[PDB]
Design an enzyme around this catalytic site. Structure first.
Site, short mmCIF file in Angstrom:
data_model
loop_
_atom_site.label_atom_id
_atom_site.label_comp_id
_atom_site.label_asym_id
_atom_site.label_seq_id
_atom_site.Cartn_x
_atom_site.Cartn_y
_atom_site.Cartn_z
N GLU A 207 0.85 -1.21 0.00
CA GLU A 207 0.00 0.00 0.00
C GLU A 207 0.88 1.24 0.00
OE1 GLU A 207 -2.05 -0.17 3.96
OE2 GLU A 207 -2.89 1.88 3.51
N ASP A 209 0.32 5.10 1.01
CA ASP A 209 -0.57 6.06 1.59
C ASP A 209 -0.17 7.45 1.15
OD1 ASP A 209 -2.10 4.09 2.85
OD2 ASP A 209 -0.80 3.97 4.53
N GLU A 212 -2.96 10.82 4.38
CA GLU A 212 -3.80 10.50 5.53
C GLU A 212 -3.75 11.74 6.37
OE1 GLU A 212 -1.74 6.51 6.32
OE2 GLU A 212 -3.90 6.30 7.07
N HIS A 223 4.09 1.46 2.43
CA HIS A 223 4.06 0.19 3.15
C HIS A 223 4.35 -0.97 2.25
CE1 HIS A 223 1.79 1.86 6.65
NE2 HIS A 223 1.32 2.70 5.74
O1 LIG Z 1 -1.88 1.29 13.72
C1 LIG Z 1 -1.99 2.68 13.84
C2 LIG Z 1 -1.13 3.36 12.79
O2 LIG Z 1 0.22 2.99 13.03
C3 LIG Z 1 1.09 3.77 12.19
O3 LIG Z 1 2.38 3.46 12.59
C4 LIG Z 1 2.91 4.05 13.75
C5 LIG Z 1 3.30 2.96 14.78
O4 LIG Z 1 2.13 2.35 15.28
C6 LIG Z 1 4.05 3.56 15.92
O5 LIG Z 1 4.62 2.47 16.63
C7 LIG Z 1 5.20 4.39 15.39
O6 LIG Z 1 5.78 5.03 16.52
O7 LIG Z 1 4.77 5.37 14.47
C8 LIG Z 1 4.14 4.80 13.33
C9 LIG Z 1 3.78 5.96 12.39
O8 LIG Z 1 2.66 6.70 12.86
C10 LIG Z 1 0.89 3.41 10.68
O9 LIG Z 1 1.74 4.14 9.73
C11 LIG Z 1 -0.58 3.61 10.37
O10 LIG Z 1 -0.95 3.23 9.02
C12 LIG Z 1 -1.45 2.90 11.36
O11 LIG Z 1 -2.81 3.23 11.04
#
Ligand SMILES: OC[C@H]1O[C@@H](O[C@H]2[C@H](O)[C@@H](O)[C@H](O)O[C@@H]2CO)[C@H](O)[C@@H](O)[C@@H]1O
Ligand SMILES: *[C@@H]1O[C@H](CO)[C@@H](O)[C@H](O)[C@H]1NC(C)=O
Length: 431
Positions: A207, A209, A212, A223
């Site tokens: 994916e 993104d 968002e 991703h």
């Molecule tokens: O699952 C929620 C959200 O996570 C996002 O990644 C985070 C991660 O959970 C956190 O551990 C880290 O510190 O930061 C990343 C980036 O925000 C992820 O990119 C999202 O798509 C997801 O919805």
């Protein structure tokens, strides 16, 4: 799932433009389609529901294959039921409509195929208005490696296809998807909310993104996944990060990266008003067979061309684009593991882009993390002062779905002027 006929399926028109350096921009008569998870599922011989609330009918749906043979997806009242409307060039997605919360649609080439976008050595541009999209919500525009026919050719059990929005997959290997691989995901079904649940299988794919965001914060995030195309997973292959896919991604959020005054209400990119978002996917040799090497972002507002903000975090080079190096440096400073590189980094991301991806547009709230990862401090057990924790200014109590659904149900996002094509050809400049 079967194709139902109780309600006609008329896809809203959403025109896009395809652009080349020499020829300029040319319109395409594209359309949008509601994702299958949001539709009425009923018996192929009448009006009886196969799924109601957060549970399946055990009589019609004893196992996945039986359910898919007995059950049909039907047409949708886009505006009435789901708060989805189009002018023909601008798509408005409303948050709460009656008992419906959110939506997700896909861009279609015609009535039975998704538009397949091949964006290596190309750029994608759109306009967005987030003036009525507050803390706790996410208006998202993204690409997923779904099949153009929604899986129809691969899975005999799926007779509905792209016309009914089938075949979703993403990098989180979601198990809340009702139909996967032409079978109902009914195994060990577990309720997770009033209208949602999860089954024993997930559906995974790479994916990208592109966007968002809400009027407080924005992020763009590749991703990659180790597989190629939509794949059903079970057990540990569905686990976040450690399984087939990188769920965390390599994100670029200007506030997280140390510029707290770049994007937001009355800031450099003023989220109180509409603006244009350009994303370019550059390869190492400037051809469509090269390796993805950088993802660049430019904004335009009130005719001013705005370069992306620069990272300002100790140990991270002061750059304003995504590259493999930036990803490695960011993952260190912030104290996160580089699952991105483990799955193959930008090069693996580029192979998915090369093979073609489907565009999704959506408005949603987040039951699991309350969108705090986008606009607040996250994770909630780390010091709000450590690098990488604060992502926006919204409170850590915000984003509770029960709350935002009561408090700001008429929230909405508007996406418009969608264009794609040769680098530098979807926008222009002059002095
Ligand atoms: O699952 C929620 C959200 O996570 C996002 O990644 C985070 C991660 O959970 C956190 O551990 C880290 O510190 O930061 C990343 C980036 O925000 C992820 O990119 C999202 O798509 C997801 O919805
Ligand atoms: C590829 O294009 C970039 C423009 O972004 C330019 O700097 C570079 O020299 C080009 N590289 C090649 C190999 O032509």
């Amino acid at each position: 799932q079967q194709a139902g006929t109780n309600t006609a399926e008329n896809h809203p028109q959403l025109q896009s433009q395809q652009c080349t350096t020499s020829g300029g921009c040319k319109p395409l008569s594209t359309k949008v389609v509601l994702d299958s998870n949001w539709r009425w599922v009923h018996s192929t011989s009448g009006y009886t529901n196969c799924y109601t609330g957060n549970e399946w009918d055990t009589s019609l749906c004893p196992d996945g294959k039986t359910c898919a043979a007995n059950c049909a997806l039907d047409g949708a009242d886009y505006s009435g039921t789901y708060g989805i409307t189009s002018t023909g060039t601008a798509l408005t997605l409303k948050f709460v409509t009656g008992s419906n919360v959110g939506s997700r649609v896909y861009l279609m080439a015609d009535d039975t195929h998704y538009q397949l976008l091949k964006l290596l050595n190309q750029e994608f541009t759109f306009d967005v208005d987030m003036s009525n999209l507050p803390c706790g919500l996410n208006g998202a525009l993204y690409l997923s490696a779904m099949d153009a026919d929604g899986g129809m050719s691969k899975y005999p059990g799926n007779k509905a296809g792209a016309k009914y929005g089938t075949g979703y997959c993403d990098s989180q290997c979601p198990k809340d998807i009702k139909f996967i691989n032409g079978e109902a995901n009914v195994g060990n079904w577990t309720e997770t909310g009033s209208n949602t649940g999860t089954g024993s299988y997930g559906t995974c794919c790479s994916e990208m993104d592109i966007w968002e965001a809400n009027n407080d914060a924005a992020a763009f995030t590749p991703h990659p996944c180790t597989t190629t195309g939509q794949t059903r997973c079970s057990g540990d292959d569905c686990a976040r990060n450690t399984g087939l896919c990188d769920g965390d991604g390599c994100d670029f959020n200007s506030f997280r990266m140390g510029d707290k005054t770049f994007l937001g209400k009355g800031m450099t990119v003023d989220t109180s008003k509409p603006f244009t978002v350009v994303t370019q996917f550059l390869t190492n040799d400037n051809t469509s067979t090269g390796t993805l090497s950088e993802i660049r972002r430019i904004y335009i507002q009130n005719g001013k061309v705005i370069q992306n903000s620069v990272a300002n975090i100790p140990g991270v080079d002061p750059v304003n684009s995504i590259t493999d190096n930036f990803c490695a440096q960011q993952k260190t400073a912030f104290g996160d593991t580089n699952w991105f590189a483990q799955k193959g980094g930008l090069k693996q991301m580029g192979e998915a882009l090369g093979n073609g991806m489907v565009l999704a547009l959506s408005i949603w709230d987040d039951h699991a993390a309350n969108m705090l990862w986008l606009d607040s401090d996250y994770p909630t057990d780390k010091d709000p002062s450590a690098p990488g924790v604060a992502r926006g200014t919204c409170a850590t109590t915000s984003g509770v779905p029960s709350d935002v659904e009561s408090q700001v149900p008429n929230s909405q996002v508007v996406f418009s002027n969608i264009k794609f094509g040769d680098i530098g050809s979807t926008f222009s400049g002059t002095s």
